[PDB]
Design a protein around this ligand. Structure first.
Ligand code: HEM
Ligand code: HEM
Ligand code: HEM
Ligand code: HEM
Lengths: 146, 139, 139, 146
C-alpha cells in the first residue's frame, strides 16, 4: 500500500489523539458483537453473553489493547507491513487458522470506531487514508496464507 | 434474518437522521468513491468531486431506498424489487460493492450519530444493510 | 432468487446422484479439508484422513440436508431452520466457509456427472448452494 | 504459495493434458454465465444473451485462450507469480478496475472446468494443489491493489 504525504499526515495526526487504552477493546468487542462467529476464538474470555458483557469484559479490553498496539506498529512501518506482521501471521494463520476475511472485518470495525470517536474530523479523505492502512495490515497478516 | 430488536434498532437509529437523510446518503457515496476507487467506474456521467450536485442528488435517492427498506422491513424483497432488477440486469453491479457501500454507510452514521451507534445498534445496522444488499443482488 | 429453470436444473442434476448421495457429500468434505485447511478445525473429534468412517457418515448427513433443500426449494428457510441454528449458534461457522464447501460440491458434481454439469446447470447449482448457504448463516 | 514436489508433479502432469485451445474459453464463458456481472467488462464481445451464445462466441473462446496462457505462464514460475503477473495486474487493477474477488472466482471456475474434463483423475489432492496455484495467481494479479 502507498499513502500520499497528505494521507500519512492525516493518519498520524489522528492516531496521536487515539485513546490507546480503549479504542482497541472497542474494536475487538464490536467485532465479537457484530460478527458473532468470531467468539469461537475467545472461549477463555468468559462472559460474552450480551453486548454490554462483551464491551465491559476486562479481557476484551486488555486484548484489544494488544491489537491496537499492532496497528500502531504497522503505522510506524507502512513500507514493511510484511516483516512487521510476520510472527502475528504465523500465529493467526498457522496456529489459530482464522479466516483472513476476518482481518478485513476487524480493520473495518476499527474504521467505524475511529469514525465514532472523531466524528466530523473523520472526513472522507481521512477515512480513505485509513482504509489503505487497514487493507495493508490485513494483507500482511494474511501473508502466511499466500 | 432480522430480529424484532434489529428492526426497532434500525428504525430508531435511522429516525434520528431527519432532514439529513439525503446528505448522509451523499456522504456515504463520497466515502465509497474515495476509499474504494473501483466503484467510481459505475458513474462515468457523474462528476464525483466534493460538492457534486450529482452525488448530492444520488445520495437522496439512495437514502429514499433505505428508508423504503426500513419502512417495509418485513417485505424487503418486494419493496426493493425494481431496484434489484436495476442493479443486477441493467447496471451489473458486482456484489462485493454492496459490502463497500454498506461499510461506508455505517461509517457515515457513526460519524454523525454517536449516541445511536452503540455496539448493539451497529450489529443491527450491519445486518440490515446486508439484508438490503442480498435483495439488491438477488435479481 | 431461484428461477423455475434453476429449480428444474438442480432437481435434475441432483436426481442423477442416486445411491452415491452420501459418497459425493463425503468427497466434497474431503476436497474442502485438503484444499482449505482452515476448515479442519471444526472437526477435532473426527479423523479427516481418506477413508475416514466419520467423514463418510458426515457426508451422508450433508447430502441429506441438500436433498431436503432440493425437495423444499421454495421453503428453504423453514426446511433448514434447525440446521441454521446449529451452524450459527452452537458451531459458530464462519460464513466464508460455506463458499468453500459450495465450491467443493460443484467440483465433486463436475467430476462425477459431466453430462449434467453444463454451463446453465453449473450456474443453477451455484445459485442453489449460495441460497442454502444464506439460510445456514442467517441464524 | 508453496507446492510440495508431489503437488507440483500432479499439477504439471495434468496441465500437459489440458486442451489449450478450449479450456480457457470454457472457464471464461462459465464465469460470464455463472457470475453475470462480469459481462460488464465484455460489451464488445457481441452475443452473450444465452449460455449457448456465450460458450460458442468466437471472442470468448479466443480471449479464454489468452487467459489460459497466463495460467500456463504462472505454472512455469510458481516462485515468481508477482513479476509474472505485473503488467496484467496494472491492466486489471489500474486500467479495468476489476474487483479482485473476481480473480478468485475465475480461478475457481477453472478448477471446476478441470474437474469437468478430468473426472476421477481430478482427485482431492490434485484439486488441493490446483487451489494453491489459482490462489497464487489471484493474489499476484491483485498486487496493484495492495
Ligand atoms: C488486523 C487484524 C488483527 C490484528 C492486528 C491482531 C492482533 C493480535 C495480537 C497483537 C495478538 C497478541 C499476540 C501475543 O500475545 O503476542 C493477538 C492474539 C490473538 N488473536 Fe488477533 N489480531 C487480528 C485479528 C484477529 C481475528 C479476526 C481473530 C479471530 C476472529 C483473532 C484471534 C486471536 C486470538 C484467539 C489470539 C490469542 C492467541 C494466543 O494468545 O495464543 N485475531 N491478535
Ligand atoms: C445500499 C445499497 C444501494 C442502494 C440502497 C442503492 C440505491 C439506488 C437507487 C435508489 C438508485 C436510483 C434508482 C433509479 O433511478 O431508478 C440507484 C442507482 C444506481 N446505483 Fe445504487 N444503490 C445501492 C448500491 C449500489 C452500489 C454498491 C453501486 C456500485 C458501486 C451502485 C451503483 C448504481 C448506479 C451506477 C446507479 C445508476 C445511476 C445513474 O445511471 O444515474 N448502487 N441506486
Ligand atoms: C452446504 C453447506 C452445509 C450443509 C448442507 C451442512 C449440513 C450439516 C449437517 C446435516 C450436519 C449434522 C446436523 C446434526 O447432526 O444435527 C452438520 C454438522 C456440522 N457441520 Fe455442516 N453443513 C454445511 C456447511 C458446513 C461448513 C462450511 C462447516 C465448517 C467448515 C460445517 C461444519 C459443521 C460441523 C462442525 C458440524 C457438527 C459435526 C459434529 O460435531 O459431529 N458445516 N452440517
Ligand atoms: C486469474 C484471473 C485472470 C487472468 C489470468 C486474466 C488474464 C487476462 C489476459 C492474459 C488478458 C489479455 C491481455 C492482453 O491482451 O495482453 C486479459 C484481458 C482482459 N481481461 Fe482478464 N484475466 C483474469 C481475470 C479477469 C476478470 C475476472 C475480468 C472481468 C470480470 C477480466 C477482464 C478482462 C478484460 C475486459 C480484458 C481486455 C482488456 C483489453 O484488451 O484492453 N479479467 N485478461
Amino acid at each position: 500500500v502507498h499513502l500520499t504525504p497528505k494521507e500519512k499526515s492525516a493518519v498520524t495526526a489522528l492516531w496521536g489523539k487515539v485513546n490507546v487504552d480503549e479504542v482497541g477493546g472497542e474494536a475487538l468487542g464490536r467485532l465479537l458483537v457484530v460478527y458473532p462467529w468470531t467468539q469461537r476464538f475467545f472461549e477463555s474470555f468468559g462472559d460474552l453473553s450480551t453486548p454490554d458483557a462483551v464491551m465491559g469484559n476486562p479481557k476484551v479490553k486488555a486484548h484489544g489493547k494488544k491489537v491496537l498496539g499492532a496497528f500502531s506498529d504497522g503505522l510506524a512501518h507502512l513500507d514493511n507491513l510484511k516483516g512487521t506482521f510476520a510472527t502475528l501471521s504465523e500465529l493467526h494463520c498457522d496456529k489459530l487458522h482464522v479466516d483472513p476475511e476476518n482481518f478485513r472485518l476487524l480493520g473495518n470495525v476499527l474504521v467505524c470506531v475511529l469514525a465514532h470517536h472523531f466524528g466530523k474530523e473523520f472526513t472522507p479523505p481521512v477515512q480513505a487514508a485509513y482504509q489503505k492502512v487497514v487493507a495493508g495490515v490485513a494483507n500482511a497478516l494474511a501473508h502466511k496464507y499466500h | 434474518v432480522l430480529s424484532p430488536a434489529d428492526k426497532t434498532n434500525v428504525k430508531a437509529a435511522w429516525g434520528k437522521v431527519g432532514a439529513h437523510a439525503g446528505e448522509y446518503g451523499a456522504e456515504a457515496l463520497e466515502r465509497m468513491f474515495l476509499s474504494f476507487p473501483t466503484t467510481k467506474t459505475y458513474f462515468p456521467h457523474f462528476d464525483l468531486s466534493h460538492g457534486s450536485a450529482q452525488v448530492k442528488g444520488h445520495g437522496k435517492k439512495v437514502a429514499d431506498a433505505l428508508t423504503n427498506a426500513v419502512a417495509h422491513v418485513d417485505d424487503m424483497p418486494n419493496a426493493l424489487s425494481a431496484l434489484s432488477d436495476l442493479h443486477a440486469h441493467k447496471l451489473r453491479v458486482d456484489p462485493v460493492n454492496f459490502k463497500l457501500l454498506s461499510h461506508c454507510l455505517l461509517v457515515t452514521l457513526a460519524a454523525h450519530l454517536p449516541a445511536e451507534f452503540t455496539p448493539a445498534v451497529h450489529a443491527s445496522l450491519d445486518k440490515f444493510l446486508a439484508s438490503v444488499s442480498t435483495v439488491l443482488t438477488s435479481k
